mmCIF file of C-alpha atoms and ligand atoms in Angstrom:
data_model
loop_
_atom_site.group_PDB
_atom_site.id
_atom_site.type_symbol
_atom_site.label_atom_id
_atom_site.label_comp_id
_atom_site.label_asym_id
_atom_site.label_seq_id
_atom_site.Cartn_x
_atom_site.Cartn_y
_atom_site.Cartn_z
ATOM 1 C CA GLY A 1 28.186 14.693 -11.368
ATOM 2 C CA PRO A 2 24.989 14.815 -9.078
ATOM 3 C CA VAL A 3 25.711 17.155 -5.565
ATOM 4 C CA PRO A 4 25.897 15.224 -3.114
ATOM 5 C CA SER A 5 23.596 15.369 0.347
ATOM 6 C CA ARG A 6 22.785 14.674 3.914
ATOM 7 C CA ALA A 7 19.803 14.506 5.990
ATOM 8 C CA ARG A 8 19.539 17.691 8.318
ATOM 9 C CA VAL A 9 18.877 15.076 11.484
ATOM 10 C CA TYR A 10 20.754 12.450 12.923
ATOM 11 C CA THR A 11 23.218 11.959 10.380
ATOM 12 C CA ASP A 12 25.658 11.009 13.219
ATOM 13 C CA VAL A 13 23.349 8.000 14.668
ATOM 14 C CA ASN A 14 25.410 5.390 13.140
ATOM 15 C CA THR A 15 28.867 7.162 14.186
ATOM 16 C CA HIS A 16 28.218 7.631 17.927
ATOM 17 C CA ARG A 17 27.064 4.004 17.980
ATOM 18 C CA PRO A 18 29.525 1.039 18.480
ATOM 19 C CA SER A 19 30.115 -0.977 14.747
ATOM 20 C CA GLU A 20 27.900 -4.196 16.027
ATOM 21 C CA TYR A 21 24.444 -1.940 16.187
ATOM 22 C CA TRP A 22 24.604 -1.737 12.254
ATOM 23 C CA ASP A 23 27.305 -3.685 10.550
ATOM 24 C CA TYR A 24 24.354 -6.272 10.630
ATOM 25 C CA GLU A 25 26.681 -8.919 8.146
ATOM 26 C CA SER A 26 28.784 -9.646 10.987
ATOM 27 C CA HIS A 27 24.999 -10.766 13.581
ATOM 28 C CA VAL A 28 25.738 -13.703 14.780
ATOM 29 C CA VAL A 29 21.768 -15.080 14.564
ATOM 30 C CA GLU A 30 20.565 -16.689 18.045
ATOM 31 C CA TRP A 31 18.070 -19.355 17.181
ATOM 32 C CA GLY A 32 14.976 -20.282 18.658
ATOM 33 C CA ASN A 33 12.933 -23.388 18.247
ATOM 34 C CA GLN A 34 10.795 -24.343 15.680
ATOM 35 C CA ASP A 35 8.521 -26.762 17.437
ATOM 36 C CA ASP A 36 7.593 -24.100 20.288
ATOM 37 C CA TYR A 37 5.140 -22.984 17.150
ATOM 38 C CA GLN A 38 1.936 -24.419 15.701
ATOM 39 C CA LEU A 39 1.020 -22.660 12.262
ATOM 40 C CA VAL A 40 -2.644 -22.154 12.228
ATOM 41 C CA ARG A 41 -3.466 -20.199 9.147
ATOM 42 C CA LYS A 42 -2.121 -18.874 5.822
ATOM 43 C CA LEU A 43 -2.994 -14.973 6.464
ATOM 44 C CA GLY A 44 -0.664 -13.619 3.110
ATOM 45 C CA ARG A 45 1.822 -14.018 0.817
ATOM 46 C CA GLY A 46 4.122 -11.118 -0.663
ATOM 47 C CA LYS A 47 7.831 -11.310 -3.009
ATOM 48 C CA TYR A 48 9.687 -12.218 0.250
ATOM 49 C CA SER A 49 7.660 -13.856 2.513
ATOM 50 C CA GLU A 50 4.464 -15.638 3.355
ATOM 51 C CA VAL A 51 3.156 -14.553 6.596
ATOM 52 C CA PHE A 52 1.316 -17.114 8.935
ATOM 53 C CA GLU A 53 -0.671 -16.862 12.331
ATOM 54 C CA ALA A 54 0.167 -19.518 14.909
ATOM 55 C CA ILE A 55 0.093 -20.196 18.619
ATOM 56 C CA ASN A 56 3.159 -20.529 20.523
ATOM 57 C CA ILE A 57 2.554 -23.732 22.643
ATOM 58 C CA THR A 58 5.350 -22.772 25.819
ATOM 59 C CA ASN A 59 2.844 -19.887 26.827
ATOM 60 C CA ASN A 60 0.014 -20.405 24.951
ATOM 61 C CA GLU A 61 -0.173 -16.916 23.318
ATOM 62 C CA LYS A 62 -0.874 -15.712 19.660
ATOM 63 C CA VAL A 63 1.729 -15.273 17.263
ATOM 64 C CA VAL A 64 2.848 -14.215 13.545
ATOM 65 C CA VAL A 65 5.114 -15.842 11.712
ATOM 66 C CA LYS A 66 6.971 -14.738 8.716
ATOM 67 C CA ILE A 67 8.895 -17.171 6.684
ATOM 68 C CA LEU A 68 10.994 -16.246 4.336
ATOM 69 C CA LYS A 69 11.787 -16.370 0.594
ATOM 70 C CA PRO A 70 14.770 -17.477 -0.384
ATOM 71 C CA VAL A 71 15.346 -14.092 -2.547
ATOM 72 C CA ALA A 72 15.017 -12.116 0.738
ATOM 73 C CA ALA A 73 17.231 -15.140 2.830
ATOM 74 C CA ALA A 74 20.208 -13.640 1.765
ATOM 75 C CA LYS A 75 19.295 -10.014 3.365
ATOM 76 C CA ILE A 76 18.217 -11.567 6.401
ATOM 77 C CA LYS A 77 20.672 -10.413 8.639
ATOM 78 C CA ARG A 78 19.885 -7.008 8.131
ATOM 79 C CA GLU A 79 15.843 -7.137 8.720
ATOM 80 C CA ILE A 80 17.052 -9.000 12.259
ATOM 81 C CA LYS A 81 19.609 -6.827 13.185
ATOM 82 C CA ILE A 82 17.120 -3.693 12.128
ATOM 83 C CA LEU A 83 13.985 -5.586 14.102
ATOM 84 C CA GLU A 84 16.120 -6.175 17.517
ATOM 85 C CA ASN A 85 17.806 -2.549 17.084
ATOM 86 C CA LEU A 86 14.085 -1.100 17.244
ATOM 87 C CA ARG A 87 12.856 -4.044 19.606
ATOM 88 C CA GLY A 88 10.440 -1.896 22.288
ATOM 89 C CA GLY A 89 10.606 1.245 20.430
ATOM 90 C CA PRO A 90 7.106 3.246 20.117
ATOM 91 C CA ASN A 91 4.249 1.330 17.504
ATOM 92 C CA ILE A 92 7.335 -0.783 15.885
ATOM 93 C CA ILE A 93 6.394 -4.245 15.314
ATOM 94 C CA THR A 94 8.448 -6.793 18.248
ATOM 95 C CA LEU A 95 9.965 -9.562 17.328
ATOM 96 C CA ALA A 96 9.445 -12.554 19.738
ATOM 97 C CA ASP A 97 11.706 -15.350 17.921
ATOM 98 C CA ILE A 98 13.802 -16.041 14.817
ATOM 99 C CA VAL A 99 13.246 -19.896 13.881
ATOM 100 C CA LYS A 100 14.636 -21.907 11.864
ATOM 101 C CA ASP A 101 11.401 -23.373 9.448
ATOM 102 C CA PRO A 102 11.751 -27.329 8.658
ATOM 103 C CA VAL A 103 10.367 -27.478 5.020
ATOM 104 C CA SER A 104 11.580 -24.241 3.554
ATOM 105 C CA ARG A 105 15.130 -24.683 5.344
ATOM 106 C CA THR A 106 14.832 -20.356 5.806
ATOM 107 C CA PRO A 107 14.574 -18.550 8.558
ATOM 108 C CA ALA A 108 11.485 -17.798 9.812
ATOM 109 C CA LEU A 109 10.886 -14.046 12.147
ATOM 110 C CA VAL A 110 7.904 -14.777 15.133
ATOM 111 C CA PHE A 111 6.443 -11.728 15.980
ATOM 112 C CA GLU A 112 3.914 -10.618 18.431
ATOM 113 C CA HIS A 113 0.078 -10.577 17.241
ATOM 114 C CA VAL A 114 -1.680 -7.488 16.192
ATOM 115 C CA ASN A 115 -5.078 -8.214 15.453
ATOM 116 C CA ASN A 116 -5.497 -5.783 12.056
ATOM 117 C CA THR A 117 -8.591 -3.993 10.943
ATOM 118 C CA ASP A 118 -9.856 -4.531 7.619
ATOM 119 C CA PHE A 119 -8.173 -1.909 4.970
ATOM 120 C CA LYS A 120 -11.839 -1.006 4.051
ATOM 121 C CA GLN A 121 -13.377 -0.280 6.967
ATOM 122 C CA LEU A 122 -10.154 1.706 8.008
ATOM 123 C CA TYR A 123 -10.238 3.792 4.876
ATOM 124 C CA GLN A 124 -14.176 4.255 4.927
ATOM 125 C CA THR A 125 -14.805 4.694 8.593
ATOM 126 C CA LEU A 126 -11.771 6.523 10.105
ATOM 127 C CA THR A 127 -12.731 9.693 11.381
ATOM 128 C CA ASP A 128 -10.751 13.164 10.849
ATOM 129 C CA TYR A 129 -10.263 12.819 15.205
ATOM 130 C CA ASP A 130 -8.717 9.642 14.389
ATOM 131 C CA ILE A 131 -6.667 10.117 11.009
ATOM 132 C CA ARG A 132 -4.760 12.958 13.210
ATOM 133 C CA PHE A 133 -4.547 10.036 16.118
ATOM 134 C CA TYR A 134 -3.185 7.614 14.021
ATOM 135 C CA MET A 135 -0.931 9.640 12.163
ATOM 136 C CA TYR A 136 0.814 10.973 15.372
ATOM 137 C CA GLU A 137 1.260 7.158 16.092
ATOM 138 C CA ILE A 138 3.199 6.386 12.675
ATOM 139 C CA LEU A 139 5.148 9.426 13.282
ATOM 140 C CA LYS A 140 6.483 8.239 16.754
ATOM 141 C CA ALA A 141 7.387 5.223 15.125
ATOM 142 C CA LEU A 142 9.026 6.840 12.271
ATOM 143 C CA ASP A 143 11.300 9.603 14.721
ATOM 144 C CA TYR A 144 12.199 6.311 16.811
ATOM 145 C CA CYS A 145 13.941 4.315 13.851
ATOM 146 C CA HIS A 146 15.159 7.946 12.031
ATOM 147 C CA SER A 147 16.355 8.607 15.761
ATOM 148 C CA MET A 148 18.148 5.264 16.012
ATOM 149 C CA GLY A 149 19.558 5.545 12.515
ATOM 150 C CA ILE A 150 17.003 3.541 9.759
ATOM 151 C CA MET A 151 15.366 4.155 7.090
ATOM 152 C CA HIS A 152 11.951 2.362 6.441
ATOM 153 C CA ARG A 153 11.638 2.525 2.951
ATOM 154 C CA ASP A 154 8.535 0.876 2.490
ATOM 155 C CA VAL A 155 5.650 3.034 4.062
ATOM 156 C CA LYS A 156 2.064 2.201 2.651
ATOM 157 C CA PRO A 157 -1.151 1.299 4.220
ATOM 158 C CA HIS A 158 -0.100 -2.596 4.306
ATOM 159 C CA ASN A 159 2.635 -1.905 6.189
ATOM 160 C CA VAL A 160 0.731 -0.390 8.579
ATOM 161 C CA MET A 161 -1.407 -2.777 10.836
ATOM 162 C CA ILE A 162 -3.956 -1.029 13.054
ATOM 163 C CA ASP A 163 -6.140 -2.877 16.099
ATOM 164 C CA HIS A 164 -8.789 0.188 15.930
ATOM 165 C CA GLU A 165 -10.779 -1.611 18.460
ATOM 166 C CA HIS A 166 -7.750 -0.955 20.950
ATOM 167 C CA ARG A 167 -6.588 2.303 19.131
ATOM 168 C CA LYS A 168 -3.134 0.061 18.500
ATOM 169 C CA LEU A 169 -1.026 0.722 15.435
ATOM 170 C CA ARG A 170 2.383 -1.032 14.504
ATOM 171 C CA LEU A 171 4.703 -0.703 12.095
ATOM 172 C CA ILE A 172 5.589 -3.834 10.409
ATOM 173 C CA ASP A 173 7.618 -5.092 7.452
ATOM 174 C CA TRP A 174 11.084 -4.025 7.746
ATOM 175 C CA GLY A 175 12.589 -5.778 4.891
ATOM 176 C CA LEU A 176 13.796 -3.111 2.985
ATOM 177 C CA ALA A 177 14.861 -1.249 5.927
ATOM 178 C CA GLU A 178 18.302 0.214 5.964
ATOM 179 C CA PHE A 179 20.819 1.842 8.121
ATOM 180 C CA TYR A 180 21.486 5.230 7.145
ATOM 181 C CA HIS A 181 25.488 6.258 6.613
ATOM 182 C CA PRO A 182 25.741 10.221 5.326
ATOM 183 C CA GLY A 183 26.938 9.907 1.422
ATOM 184 C CA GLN A 184 25.900 6.376 0.730
ATOM 185 C CA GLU A 185 24.138 5.609 -2.346
ATOM 186 C CA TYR A 186 21.179 3.670 -2.077
ATOM 187 C CA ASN A 187 19.094 1.422 -4.634
ATOM 188 C CA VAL A 188 16.382 3.643 -6.074
ATOM 189 C CA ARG A 189 14.127 0.193 -6.186
ATOM 190 C CA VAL A 190 12.619 0.595 -2.991
ATOM 191 C CA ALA A 191 8.843 1.570 -1.831
ATOM 192 C CA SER A 192 5.713 0.943 -3.678
ATOM 193 C CA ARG A 193 5.090 3.031 -6.963
ATOM 194 C CA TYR A 194 2.187 5.431 -5.498
ATOM 195 C CA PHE A 195 4.677 5.967 -2.379
ATOM 196 C CA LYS A 196 8.040 6.167 -4.355
ATOM 197 C CA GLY A 197 9.393 10.194 -3.260
ATOM 198 C CA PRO A 198 10.482 12.164 -6.192
ATOM 199 C CA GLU A 199 13.907 11.673 -5.544
ATOM 200 C CA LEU A 200 13.884 7.348 -6.005
ATOM 201 C CA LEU A 201 12.205 8.276 -9.503
ATOM 202 C CA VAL A 202 14.568 10.983 -10.863
ATOM 203 C CA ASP A 203 17.753 7.843 -9.637
ATOM 204 C CA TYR A 204 18.963 10.559 -7.106
ATOM 205 C CA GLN A 205 20.616 7.764 -4.688
ATOM 206 C CA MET A 206 21.929 9.660 -1.747
ATOM 207 C CA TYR A 207 18.451 9.740 -0.317
ATOM 208 C CA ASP A 208 17.656 9.724 4.044
ATOM 209 C CA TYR A 209 14.783 8.865 6.253
ATOM 210 C CA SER A 210 13.064 12.027 4.692
ATOM 211 C CA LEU A 211 11.863 9.203 1.674
ATOM 212 C CA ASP A 212 9.528 8.028 4.663
ATOM 213 C CA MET A 213 8.023 11.503 5.052
ATOM 214 C CA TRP A 214 6.865 11.629 1.317
ATOM 215 C CA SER A 215 5.307 8.188 1.836
ATOM 216 C CA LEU A 216 3.332 8.997 4.656
ATOM 217 C CA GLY A 217 2.288 12.583 3.065
ATOM 218 C CA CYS A 218 0.868 10.658 0.428
ATOM 219 C CA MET A 219 -0.916 8.088 2.720
ATOM 220 C CA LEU A 220 -2.814 11.306 4.294
ATOM 221 C CA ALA A 221 -3.733 13.120 1.023
ATOM 222 C CA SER A 222 -5.410 9.851 -0.140
ATOM 223 C CA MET A 223 -7.132 9.666 3.065
ATOM 224 C CA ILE A 224 -8.428 13.259 3.484
ATOM 225 C CA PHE A 225 -8.877 13.963 -0.287
ATOM 226 C CA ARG A 226 -10.658 10.296 -0.897
ATOM 227 C CA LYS A 227 -8.389 9.948 -3.400
ATOM 228 C CA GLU A 228 -7.104 6.334 -3.233
ATOM 229 C CA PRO A 229 -4.196 6.186 -4.619
ATOM 230 C CA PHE A 230 -3.344 10.031 -4.445
ATOM 231 C CA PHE A 231 -0.479 9.981 -7.014
ATOM 232 C CA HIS A 232 -1.717 7.299 -9.485
ATOM 233 C CA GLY A 233 0.975 6.523 -11.709
ATOM 234 C CA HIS A 234 0.622 4.093 -14.253
ATOM 235 C CA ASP A 235 4.331 2.845 -14.431
ATOM 236 C CA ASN A 236 7.551 4.933 -12.539
ATOM 237 C CA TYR A 237 7.828 7.559 -15.279
ATOM 238 C CA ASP A 238 4.255 8.571 -15.388
ATOM 239 C CA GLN A 239 4.558 8.349 -11.281
ATOM 240 C CA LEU A 240 6.685 11.636 -11.326
ATOM 241 C CA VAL A 241 4.381 13.076 -14.324
ATOM 242 C CA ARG A 242 0.994 12.955 -11.778
ATOM 243 C CA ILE A 243 3.144 14.304 -9.081
ATOM 244 C CA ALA A 244 4.197 17.146 -11.327
ATOM 245 C CA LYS A 245 0.288 17.684 -12.240
ATOM 246 C CA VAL A 246 0.330 18.369 -8.228
ATOM 247 C CA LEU A 247 3.080 20.645 -7.084
ATOM 248 C CA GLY A 248 3.767 21.624 -10.484
ATOM 249 C CA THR A 249 7.502 21.205 -12.719
ATOM 250 C CA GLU A 250 8.960 24.650 -11.906
ATOM 251 C CA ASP A 251 9.460 23.188 -8.331
ATOM 252 C CA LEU A 252 10.319 20.024 -10.198
ATOM 253 C CA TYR A 253 13.284 21.460 -12.065
ATOM 254 C CA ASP A 254 14.699 23.816 -9.321
ATOM 255 C CA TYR A 255 14.751 20.017 -7.373
ATOM 256 C CA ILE A 256 17.233 18.334 -9.680
ATOM 257 C CA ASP A 257 19.185 22.025 -10.931
ATOM 258 C CA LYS A 258 20.075 22.227 -6.825
ATOM 259 C CA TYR A 259 21.112 18.931 -6.911
ATOM 260 C CA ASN A 260 22.027 18.731 -10.266
ATOM 261 C CA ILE A 261 20.433 16.007 -11.586
ATOM 262 C CA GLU A 262 19.296 15.222 -15.004
ATOM 263 C CA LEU A 263 16.009 13.773 -15.564
ATOM 264 C CA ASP A 264 15.801 10.670 -18.146
ATOM 265 C CA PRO A 265 15.282 12.536 -21.576
ATOM 266 C CA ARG A 266 12.245 9.843 -22.096
ATOM 267 C CA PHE A 267 10.349 12.513 -19.864
ATOM 268 C CA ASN A 268 10.535 15.012 -22.659
ATOM 269 C CA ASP A 269 7.440 13.470 -24.178
ATOM 270 C CA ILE A 270 5.625 13.093 -21.395
ATOM 271 C CA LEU A 271 6.333 15.648 -18.413
ATOM 272 C CA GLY A 272 5.006 18.903 -20.119
ATOM 273 C CA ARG A 273 4.049 22.244 -18.115
ATOM 274 C CA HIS A 274 2.390 22.267 -15.013
ATOM 275 C CA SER A 275 1.926 24.789 -12.549
ATOM 276 C CA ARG A 276 1.722 24.217 -8.659
ATOM 277 C CA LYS A 277 -1.897 23.945 -7.953
ATOM 278 C CA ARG A 278 -3.333 24.979 -4.171
ATOM 279 C CA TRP A 279 -4.581 22.242 -2.426
ATOM 280 C CA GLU A 280 -8.176 23.370 -1.899
ATOM 281 C CA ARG A 281 -8.485 22.223 -5.450
ATOM 282 C CA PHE A 282 -9.153 18.812 -4.253
ATOM 283 C CA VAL A 283 -11.411 19.680 -2.000
ATOM 284 C CA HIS A 284 -15.209 18.520 -2.730
ATOM 285 C CA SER A 285 -18.406 18.075 -0.311
ATOM 286 C CA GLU A 286 -17.295 14.189 -0.158
ATOM 287 C CA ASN A 287 -14.300 14.577 1.873
ATOM 288 C CA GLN A 288 -14.386 18.367 3.685
ATOM 289 C CA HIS A 289 -15.301 16.216 6.974
ATOM 290 C CA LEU A 290 -11.798 15.673 6.852
ATOM 291 C CA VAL A 291 -9.991 18.540 5.344
ATOM 292 C CA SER A 292 -9.212 21.441 7.562
ATOM 293 C CA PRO A 293 -6.342 24.555 7.162
ATOM 294 C CA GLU A 294 -3.971 22.440 9.453
ATOM 295 C CA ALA A 295 -4.174 19.333 7.111
ATOM 296 C CA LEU A 296 -3.668 20.978 4.223
ATOM 297 C CA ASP A 297 -0.607 23.282 5.739
ATOM 298 C CA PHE A 298 0.483 20.034 6.922
ATOM 299 C CA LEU A 299 0.483 17.972 3.707
ATOM 300 C CA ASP A 300 1.986 21.100 2.306
ATOM 301 C CA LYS A 301 5.061 20.800 4.109
ATOM 302 C CA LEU A 302 5.475 16.595 3.799
ATOM 303 C CA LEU A 303 4.518 16.787 0.258
ATOM 304 C CA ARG A 304 7.823 18.467 -1.355
ATOM 305 C CA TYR A 305 10.081 17.233 -4.348
ATOM 306 C CA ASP A 306 13.557 18.674 -2.125
ATOM 307 C CA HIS A 307 13.773 15.755 0.067
ATOM 308 C CA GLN A 308 15.858 18.361 2.605
ATOM 309 C CA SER A 309 12.862 20.677 2.712
ATOM 310 C CA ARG A 310 10.417 18.463 3.457
ATOM 311 C CA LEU A 311 9.053 18.132 7.858
ATOM 312 C CA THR A 312 11.299 15.817 10.002
ATOM 313 C CA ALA A 313 9.230 12.861 11.619
ATOM 314 C CA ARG A 314 9.863 15.259 15.594
ATOM 315 C CA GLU A 315 9.104 18.226 13.458
ATOM 316 C CA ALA A 316 5.686 16.946 11.944
ATOM 317 C CA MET A 317 4.804 16.425 15.764
ATOM 318 C CA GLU A 318 4.780 19.783 16.443
ATOM 319 C CA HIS A 319 2.400 20.856 13.944
ATOM 320 C CA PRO A 320 -0.619 22.663 14.405
ATOM 321 C CA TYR A 321 -2.912 19.594 12.948
ATOM 322 C CA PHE A 322 -1.944 17.476 15.839
ATOM 323 C CA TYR A 323 -3.377 20.087 18.605
ATOM 324 C CA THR A 324 -6.731 18.349 18.964
ATOM 325 C CA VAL A 325 -4.894 14.498 19.796
ATOM 326 C CA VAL A 326 -4.937 13.870 23.288
ATOM 327 C CA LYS A 327 -1.599 13.482 24.713
HETATM 328 C C1 AFW B 401 -4.067 5.340 3.244
HETATM 329 O O1 AFW B 401 -4.006 4.710 3.957
HETATM 330 C C2 AFW B 401 -4.499 5.123 5.533
HETATM 331 C C3 AFW B 401 -3.596 6.217 5.351
HETATM 332 C C4 AFW B 401 -3.479 7.583 6.608
HETATM 333 C C5 AFW B 401 -3.914 7.017 7.543
HETATM 334 C C6 AFW B 401 -3.881 7.072 9.064
HETATM 335 F F1 AFW B 401 -3.610 8.608 8.990
HETATM 336 F F2 AFW B 401 -4.912 7.526 9.958
HETATM 337 F F3 AFW B 401 -2.325 6.998 9.786
HETATM 338 C C7 AFW B 401 -4.678 5.400 7.995
HETATM 339 C C8 AFW B 401 -4.233 4.065 6.571
HETATM 340 C C9 AFW B 401 -3.835 3.349 7.122
HETATM 341 C C10 AFW B 401 -2.915 2.277 7.534
HETATM 342 C C11 AFW B 401 -3.355 0.875 7.273
HETATM 343 C C12 AFW B 401 -4.430 0.208 6.823
HETATM 344 C C13 AFW B 401 -4.687 -1.621 6.779
HETATM 345 N N1 AFW B 401 -3.421 -2.060 7.221
HETATM 346 C C14 AFW B 401 -5.769 1.529 6.404
HETATM 347 C C15 AFW B 401 -5.294 2.746 6.267
HETATM 348 CL CL1 AFW B 401 -6.668 3.162 5.703
#
């Protein structure tokens, strides 16, 4: 069968911490008062929740209320526990309260308010300097949650709120986050298609924090090359083929051979043979202002098939790409 794998970092964090830390099922939720909050406007709705701008009428502060849907309701303890464990961490969204929505009869998570700049404005106007600055801010959040034994598993632009006016960033939506336990087999049906790591696409279940580093690399590649999304698969199978047209099929075969993974035979009719492409191939006059030898070298070290070979968040923070960023 497949060869087991374990993270090269933070392998023991959930061992060194008491069971109360990671055993979310045993966690008792201390409910607040739903009447403290007045809903102002609906901000959006996803697969698992409906998000609203609200006012905490007790202290007159702006908040965000996330009313979980019934499907999300079963796994709320995991999200709550993770949010409470990470509260106060750098660039981690702050959970302010947990109440029971009167109408939905489900839990509603109350967060600090962040004024998020629209995607278009950020995607189209962030400078090379801003990209390095915000990438470093995301790395602070990822090294914090990884060091705390948690993998986000849904790193993508929709889950990164940026208040550009105040140069403030928060990593949000911890609904898909999990505690990392060495040897544990995890559901591969996590992350949005374009951000899914090769481990998910080849059905390798014993993955870890490094999945977040692949997703981060996908966001960086799209941003610096002006190619949104970078790996534009039509489905989960074509997703791996799009990756292979860049990274090459030889390193993909070395990866699955290392972990004794068998590719799904449906790949025989679509994968083909592809050489590894040099990152300079994606450079052109419309993205040259965002590219540098340091950016390409950084990207190269995140976007690797072998989840054990990618830079960790802490190593990534040491990279020359961030030398220009004011610390
Ligand atoms: C492809 O998206 C990104 C890619 C890289 C970066 C960063 F390098 F600056 F950190 C930010 C975004 C982004 C992150 C979040 C949003 C809006 N929620 C918008 C954008 Cl453009």
